[PDB]
RNA sequence: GAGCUAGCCCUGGCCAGGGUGAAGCUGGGGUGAGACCCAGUGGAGGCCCGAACCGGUGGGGGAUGCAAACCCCUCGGAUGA
RNA sequence: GAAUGCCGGCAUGAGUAACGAUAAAGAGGGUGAGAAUCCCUCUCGCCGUAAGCCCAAGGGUUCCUACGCAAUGGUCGUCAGCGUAGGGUUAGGCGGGACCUAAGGUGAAGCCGAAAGGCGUAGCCGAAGGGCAGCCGGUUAAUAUUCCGGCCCUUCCCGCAGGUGCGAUGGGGGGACGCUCUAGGCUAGGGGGACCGGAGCCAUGGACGAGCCCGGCCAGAAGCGCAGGGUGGGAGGUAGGCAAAUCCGCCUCCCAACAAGCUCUGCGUGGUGGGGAAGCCCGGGUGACAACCCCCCGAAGCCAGGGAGCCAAGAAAAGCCUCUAAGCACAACCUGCGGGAACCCGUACCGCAAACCGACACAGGUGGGCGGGUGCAAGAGCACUCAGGCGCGCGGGAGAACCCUCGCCAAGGAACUCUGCAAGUUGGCCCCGUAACUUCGGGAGAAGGGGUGCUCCCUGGGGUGAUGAGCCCCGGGGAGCCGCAGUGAACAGGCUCUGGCGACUGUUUACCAAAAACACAGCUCUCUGCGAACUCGUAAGAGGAGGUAUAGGGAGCGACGCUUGCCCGGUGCCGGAAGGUCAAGGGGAGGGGUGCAAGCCCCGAACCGAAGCCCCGGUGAACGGCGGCCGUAACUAUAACGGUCCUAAGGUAGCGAAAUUCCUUGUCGGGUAAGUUCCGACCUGCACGAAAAGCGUAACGACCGGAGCGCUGUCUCGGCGAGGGACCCGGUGAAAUUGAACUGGCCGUGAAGAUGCGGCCUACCCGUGGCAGGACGAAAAGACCCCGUGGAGCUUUACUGCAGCC
RNA sequence: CGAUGUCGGCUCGUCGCAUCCUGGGGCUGAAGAAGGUCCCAAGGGUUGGGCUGUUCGCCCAUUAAAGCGGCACGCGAGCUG
RNA sequence: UGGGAGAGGGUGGUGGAAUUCCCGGAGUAGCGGUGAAAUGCGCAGAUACCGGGAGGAACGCCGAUGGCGAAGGCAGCCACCUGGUCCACCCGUGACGCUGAGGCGCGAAAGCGUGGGGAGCAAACCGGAUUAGAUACCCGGGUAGUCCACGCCCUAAACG
RNA sequence: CCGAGGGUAGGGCCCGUGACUGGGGCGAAGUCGUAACAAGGUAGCUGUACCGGAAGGUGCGGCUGGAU
């Protein structure tokens, strides 16, 4: 449930903040963090390759366990739920009876004190992880691998989930968060439940300053520029687009599909996204 | 007002210095040309 | 050629004093329980006034200048993008 | 002889402008060939969150002393950051290196690229971050945490003693972190003392005093005291920490647990070592056997890795500790003690500036620390002033115009003007009080008004003591006194009503635009299933992202409220296994060249053969578009209504003479004595209109309009006064410009605006202060305009290519 | 065109006369007073304000009158902008 | 105290029929729709048929002139949580009662806000008819909405 | 000291009036269509919502004060 402010400044009128209610611990595990090397959007040539990035709060990267088939059969106790500045999901600290400590992304409904486990034999309960082929059809699931042992790729952001829809051969059919219907190999691991912090999308940033804390520099419209800069540049006074609306690099940006046509994974995609 | 020359000894040696020139095809042509012209100094003097 | 300037990255530093008084908390009131109201506590904010600091609004001066952009008065921001 | 030619020399302007902040000078003595300018003394003025002191950059001998004055110094010069010479910088503990890692750079392995080269996990380099042992005083002309003195400390080597399973580049702990707010206790720093020490003073009417003036500390091992930081202890189990592990992690039990214990830091004390004023006397002597105490205020600094709250969730590595592996366990390590050993580089001086960046001894720019006192509510603000530092490297007169900066003004009070531009007014604090409207925060310091000094008396609470006096902070009541005036000086909003635009704080054309422009939360379209789309790169590699559709890219719109209509024929995008067209290639009917021949060589029809295009359909917060004419109602007028041409369809809601309205100062209403502006209306909208969004909107604005009140030298309309110049004298002494000049007016003439030609008029020779009508005055080979088969930026359904994609 | 700066205002004037006023006249459909029209006449004079960048013009209150033109649409090495 | 009936309310789950859509198969010259038609869809393979899948909404028979609730209103089935109500016993209390200005709560549908969902239906809208015309009735499309959560709105022929 | 009242400033209520504008009542000799009363030629009415020259239409739900 997102929190609101009284309008005691112009920006607090609309600003909203996460309530941070699931958070039970306010410092990361020291042995599970490393420095997150800020890029400013610049590549190894020093060139900006993603515009308008930089200047956000310093962050430490929390090492997340996106495998879990790593430790089949070894249960762990959910020791804490924490904030992670590098993702929209919250993260949950796991204490394995092994003594090993790792982070997973916190599912919706996880409780500190409960246990979770991974493997072909794990009970179908929130926070457990199994190869897809052992999760009952209809189960909503998250942190799904795309190919076996390659690491969880799908349904990782706050509130998202995939639904198991059916089985065909070595493969399982998933409804991804985008509504796409996709075959995924049955030996791919998933974790049962949806990702937590589902209210993330109701945050109202409230002021320009708040984007800046997030490392989002101001985005300037092509129409505000000159012809040297952008297809929409120029014109006396305001100007409509005067041509098919385009990117700074000239390609059309209202409908033009851009997935590569001869891509091998097309054989595994059943239905393009909806909406 | 703040003008263009703001001397800095490290910056000087690291930008125009002998080792920077030698690191690079164009920088070695600088030294080659400056020796052929008979320059008394091949790179800028900076105190260090 | 980025010792000027623009942006980003790493690591440090700086922001007198005063004002306003959000949430929360506590107490009292209220109710079937509440919402809520009141007081105290509290100390939030691209909040207010104002130096340093960052600016450069209007006028005057300067105009072979003190200065190839300066000077006086006035003026904007000053915990923040 | 000319090229705004080139190089050099030398003129003119001209003894002209100027001599670089309006903080300011005067005199006496000295030196010397020479003195406003150097030294000394007295007086005066200026800075004092600096214009004083310390550090880092940068600079590189500018430092100190002697001897000098040609040049440098905006004058002068005996002086100097200048010339010549001599001297001067001293470290195990300060900074850097023999330590660590950050971005980044480099780069074994590896990857890529015609060459050159580009990348690249480890490693290495890389600091103003981490880490690490020195404080106070004395001394030199010039260095001092460096020399010396006193008291401390670090590492390395060796040795002795005691102790222990010792041992690492490997494992683990730790190092290790934000923002805002903040407790307790201290210290730095400061104020007061009738107390302690002190040379002396009694003036000019009074005072021999609880008088004046001066000072009343600094460092310090162990120990101790006070205040804090850090840390749970034992056993058992163990499959994780890429070997091992007794360590760490996990589970369980016991005790201890906001106590303690151990440990570390700060502060105080502490053997000991220092310092030590005014005044007087010639930096030194004296003061002095100096005294060295009490009270109060008190940090943003210290204890510190403290505490709380919050969201935007806040380096690494080494030192250090612990664990074990090879090994080795006569070794090795640990603790104490002792002796020895301890390298390289920097250190002068300037450092908000005459020594740095600005060509200059340039009113500009330059990061960190200290930055005293009193009063003003506070403060780093303001005024004065301490220590300390200065009077700004031309002066002397005069007392015009004019200019600058400043002060005042009768009566009027915006009549000024494009505009109240400018300048007045207002101005801090306390108290009373405060509207529409509103998103309920605000609007608000709304507006408007009262108080403000000093004296006496009474008294309230808080801090420090002790619970009292004393001190200190915030008060309250009564009664009085003085002046024109009590934030008595300095620093310190003029206010209101009403439109446009932009929601808001922000950002911008460095150096003519700060805005209504950009950005902005927020809204919508669209792409992207992850080796993502997209971006840079030939590539490898990177960013995206160690992210995963509540995510990432592109586009438009721009808080919020209420909304966002109709047209898909054209263009775009999306969908469409049919059909048409469709290149290489496949196919080979048929035909040709040549050879005596087999054969060799060539042309070539049907047929098969992709994307693309054509074709079918969808699609507007995709590019975009959103009519005309005739007729009709009891009077006129108009036309709900009908007709008809055209179209893809004919502009909806809302708004409208508008940041849009040509005609236009439309018309009407408001305001004014008077209103091309402004506000409110009307609608024949030349030429509004719904995300190039439409219409509104509280709050906000150095934005742009209109009005009023207050107040004014803006003005009627000008006067006076001040200082810095202008002016005169001494010193120094530019500049653009310049065919040459012995350079008047009129009326004509002349390439059409004549000092220069004609006629006539006027006119003795030469300067000085002034004014700008002319010399088609200076500057800049006109930016406008045209021309050149000149250039460059930009666009596209111009042409032709290319990357990219299919 | 190797540059002749532009509208309007302010300031400062000066000139022409086809005269706005004041002075002198003739004619009148001039009783008087007040006008109309023409002639002579350039000596002097020819207001303040609202609107608008305005010149101009309209308006307010006055006036003897509120003249019209030239001087590089006079005057930016005089100012404004 | 001991019993009963009930679509009374709230929460979580769950079943089958049907519509539409997607895939596979089979098949071809129309289907659909109306008073009659046309638009629409269909040789780019529709309709009709069979198999598989997805998804939302509503619950046939039982079902009634029925039941329950204060009203609005409530209907597959299971469980949990929970309200009202009736009956028998005549056991307890001892008038503890009725009404009720204000207040507070509830309050069909449509509508609003934020998020989700979207099969069918369907304001607005587009097109075909009808008609003198037809901004309607009928037909083919079709967006809000209808559905869920939370917050508003507070109306009605909210009627007996 | 209080004090009629006068003066400055800011609020509240009420009346009269205003370019222009909204609908209402009445007049009736007009133009358009015909929504309701019969099954009124689409049963009517209804709250709400969206739309249309106009009466009105349609959606959702409700009522019978509906003919057969
Ligand atoms: Mg929650
Ligand atoms: Mg809020
Ligand atoms: Mg709040
Ligand atoms: Mg709230
Ligand atoms: Mg606001
Ligand atoms: Mg919160
Ligand atoms: Mg949470
Ligand atoms: Mg990382
Ligand atoms: Mg990174
Ligand atoms: Mg790199
Ligand atoms: Mg590079
Ligand atoms: Mg960027
Ligand atoms: Mg998180
Ligand atoms: Mg969140
Ligand atoms: Mg948002
Ligand atoms: Mg961030
Ligand atoms: Mg953005
Ligand atoms: Mg933008
Ligand atoms: Mg532009
Ligand atoms: Mg460019
Ligand atoms: Mg281009
Ligand atoms: Mg372009
Ligand atoms: Mg354009
Ligand atoms: Mg244009
Ligand atoms: Mg433009
Ligand atoms: Mg335009
Ligand atoms: Mg533009
Ligand atoms: Mg534009
Ligand atoms: Mg614009
Ligand atoms: Mg255009
Ligand atoms: Mg456009
Ligand atoms: Mg166009
Ligand atoms: Mg592309
Ligand atoms: Mg795949
Ligand atoms: Mg610099
Ligand atoms: Mg230099
Ligand atoms: Mg340097
Ligand atoms: Mg340096
Ligand atoms: Mg450097
Ligand atoms: Mg170098
Ligand atoms: Mg040279
Ligand atoms: Mg040499
Ligand atoms: Mg060189
Ligand atoms: Mg830092
Ligand atoms: Mg500040
Ligand atoms: Mg308070
Ligand atoms: Mg709290
Ligand atoms: Mg602020
Ligand atoms: Mg503030
Ligand atoms: Mg402020
Ligand atoms: Mg200025
Ligand atoms: Mg001014
Ligand atoms: Mg002035
Ligand atoms: Mg000037
Ligand atoms: Mg200045
Ligand atoms: Mg100034
Ligand atoms: Mg301020
Ligand atoms: Mg401040
Ligand atoms: Mg701010
Ligand atoms: Mg010649
Ligand atoms: Mg010349
Ligand atoms: Mg010349
Ligand atoms: Mg020449
Ligand atoms: Mg020359
Ligand atoms: Mg000369
Ligand atoms: Mg002279
Ligand atoms: Mg002269
Ligand atoms: Mg002298
Ligand atoms: Mg002399
Ligand atoms: Mg002297
Ligand atoms: Mg001071
Ligand atoms: Mg130098
Ligand atoms: Mg020295
Ligand atoms: Mg020297
Ligand atoms: Mg000399
Ligand atoms: Mg000399
Ligand atoms: Mg000289
Ligand atoms: Mg000089
Ligand atoms: Mg001499
Ligand atoms: Mg000198
Ligand atoms: Mg010497
Ligand atoms: Mg030493
Ligand atoms: Mg060594
Ligand atoms: Mg290293
Ligand atoms: Mg390299
Ligand atoms: Mg270092
Ligand atoms: Mg050191
Ligand atoms: Mg020490
Ligand atoms: Mg020395
Ligand atoms: Mg030991
Ligand atoms: Mg960390
Ligand atoms: Mg750090
Ligand atoms: Mg901050
Ligand atoms: Mg404290
Ligand atoms: Mg001390
Ligand atoms: Mg004090
Ligand atoms: Mg006496
Ligand atoms: Mg203590
Ligand atoms: Mg073990
Ligand atoms: Mg002494
Ligand atoms: Mg002695
Ligand atoms: Mg003594
Ligand atoms: Mg502070
Ligand atoms: Mg957050
Ligand atoms: Mg942290
Ligand atoms: Mg690292
Ligand atoms: Mg061994
Ligand atoms: Mg060595
Ligand atoms: Mg030194
Ligand atoms: Mg100096
Ligand atoms: Mg300065
Ligand atoms: Mg100095
Ligand atoms: Mg110099
Ligand atoms: Mg000087
Ligand atoms: Mg200077
Ligand atoms: Mg001090
Ligand atoms: Mg004051
Ligand atoms: Mg003050
Ligand atoms: Mg100030
Ligand atoms: Mg003083
Ligand atoms: Mg002076
Ligand atoms: Mg004179
Ligand atoms: Mg001055
Ligand atoms: Mg006056
Ligand atoms: Mg006035
Ligand atoms: Mg007045
Ligand atoms: Mg004005
Ligand atoms: Mg004033
Ligand atoms: Mg004042
Ligand atoms: Mg008002
Ligand atoms: Mg309010
Ligand atoms: Mg506000
Ligand atoms: Mg106001
Ligand atoms: Mg007094
Ligand atoms: Mg002052
Ligand atoms: Mg003020
Ligand atoms: Mg004013
Ligand atoms: Mg107002
Ligand atoms: Mg206007
Ligand atoms: Mg607007
Ligand atoms: Mg703005
Ligand atoms: Mg703007
Ligand atoms: Mg707005
Ligand atoms: Mg906005
Ligand atoms: Mg803004
Ligand atoms: Mg600000
Ligand atoms: Mg410019
Ligand atoms: Mg500019
Ligand atoms: Mg420039
Ligand atoms: Mg410029
Ligand atoms: Mg300017
Ligand atoms: Mg500007
Ligand atoms: Mg501004
Ligand atoms: Mg801009
Ligand atoms: Mg903008
Ligand atoms: Mg919006
Ligand atoms: Mg590229
Ligand atoms: Mg890569
Ligand atoms: Mg990446
Ligand atoms: Mg990455
Ligand atoms: Mg991502
Ligand atoms: Mg914008
Ligand atoms: Mg815009
Ligand atoms: Mg509103
Ligand atoms: Mg329409
Ligand atoms: Mg179209
Ligand atoms: Mg189209
Ligand atoms: Mg169509
Ligand atoms: Mg086109
Ligand atoms: Mg053949
Ligand atoms: Mg032949
Ligand atoms: Mg094809
Ligand atoms: Mg739309
Ligand atoms: Mg078109
Ligand atoms: Mg468009
Ligand atoms: Mg008629
Ligand atoms: Mg109009
Ligand atoms: Mg008008
Ligand atoms: Mg308008
Ligand atoms: Mg227009
Ligand atoms: Mg026109
Ligand atoms: Mg007009
Ligand atoms: Mg006009
Ligand atoms: Mg008018
Ligand atoms: Mg105006
Ligand atoms: Mg105007
Ligand atoms: Mg009109
Ligand atoms: Mg646009
Ligand atoms: Mg526009
Ligand atoms: Mg508007
Ligand atoms: Mg507004
Ligand atoms: Mg603004
Ligand atoms: Mg502004
Ligand atoms: Mg004056
Ligand atoms: Mg005076
Ligand atoms: Mg004067
Ligand atoms: Mg003077
Ligand atoms: Mg004077
Ligand atoms: Mg004389
Ligand atoms: Mg001559
Ligand atoms: Mg001539
Ligand atoms: Mg002539
Ligand atoms: Mg002549
Ligand atoms: Mg002659
Ligand atoms: Mg002749
Ligand atoms: Mg002649
Ligand atoms: Mg004459
Ligand atoms: Mg002249
Ligand atoms: Mg002159
Ligand atoms: Mg001449
Ligand atoms: Mg001239
Ligand atoms: Mg001239
Ligand atoms: Mg030329
Ligand atoms: Mg030319
Ligand atoms: Mg030209
Ligand atoms: Mg030129
Ligand atoms: Mg031309
Ligand atoms: Mg040509
Ligand atoms: Mg030609
Ligand atoms: Mg070109
Ligand atoms: Mg010309
Ligand atoms: Mg010339
Ligand atoms: Mg010229
Ligand atoms: Mg008569
Ligand atoms: Mg006559
Ligand atoms: Mg006559
Ligand atoms: Mg005259
Ligand atoms: Mg005359
Ligand atoms: Mg006018
Ligand atoms: Mg006019
Ligand atoms: Mg007129
Ligand atoms: Mg009169
Ligand atoms: Mg003229
Ligand atoms: Mg003319
Ligand atoms: Mg003309
Ligand atoms: Mg002229
Ligand atoms: Mg004129
Ligand atoms: Mg002129
Ligand atoms: Mg001028
Ligand atoms: Mg002019
Ligand atoms: Mg001139
Ligand atoms: Mg002139
Ligand atoms: Mg001239
Ligand atoms: Mg002007
Ligand atoms: Mg202008
Ligand atoms: Mg076929
Ligand atoms: Mg039934
Ligand atoms: Mg019934
Ligand atoms: Mg009984
Ligand atoms: Mg309701
Ligand atoms: Mg409903
Ligand atoms: Mg609804
Ligand atoms: Mg649908
Ligand atoms: Mg019709
Ligand atoms: Mg709608
Ligand atoms: Mg809606
Ligand atoms: Mg009923
Ligand atoms: Mg009276
Ligand atoms: Mg009807
Ligand atoms: Mg009818
Ligand atoms: Mg009917
Ligand atoms: Mg309508
Ligand atoms: Mg009509
Ligand atoms: Mg309809
Ligand atoms: Mg009902």
Residue numbers in the entry:
A (entry chain 1D): 2 to 276
B (entry chain 17): 1 to 48
Paper quotes:
Many of currently used antibiotics inhibit protein synthesis in pathogenic microorganisms by targeting their 70S ribosomes, which are complex macromolecular machines responsible for this process. The catalytic peptidyl transferase center (PTC) located at the heart of the large ribosomal subunit (50S in bacteria) polymerizes amino acids into polypeptides in the order specified by the nucleotide sequences of the translated mRNAs. Newly-made proteins emerge from the ribosome through the nascent peptide exit tunnel (NPET) that spans the body of the large ribosomal subunit beginning at the PTC and ending on the opposite side of the large ribosomal subunit facing the cytoplasm.
The activity of HygA-macrolide pairs against bacteria harboring erm resistance genes prompted us to determine X-ray crystal structures of HygA-macrolide combinations bound to the Erm-methylated 70S ribosome containing N6-dimethylated residue m26A2058. Using our recent methodology, Erm-modified 70S ribosomes were isolated from Tth cells expressing the erm-like gene from Bifidobacterium thermophilum. Remarkably, the observed electron-density maps revealed strong peaks corresponding to HygA and the macrolides (ERY, AZI, or TEL) bound to the A2058-N6-dimethylated ribosomes (respectively), allowing us to build molecular models unambiguously. In the case of TEL alone (without HygA), the observed electron density is somewhat stronger and less fragmented than that of ERY, in agreement with the residual binding affinity of ketolides for the Erm-methylated ribosome. In the Erm-methylated ribosome, this water molecule is displaced due to direct sterical hindrance with the methyl groups appended to the A2058 residue, rationalizing the significantly reduced affinity of macrolides to the Erm-modified ribosome. Interestingly, the dimethylamino moiety of the desosamine sugars of ERY, AZI, or TEL rotates by ~180° around the C-N bond and finds a new H-bonding partner—the carbonyl oxygen of the fucofuranose ring of ribosome-bound HygA.
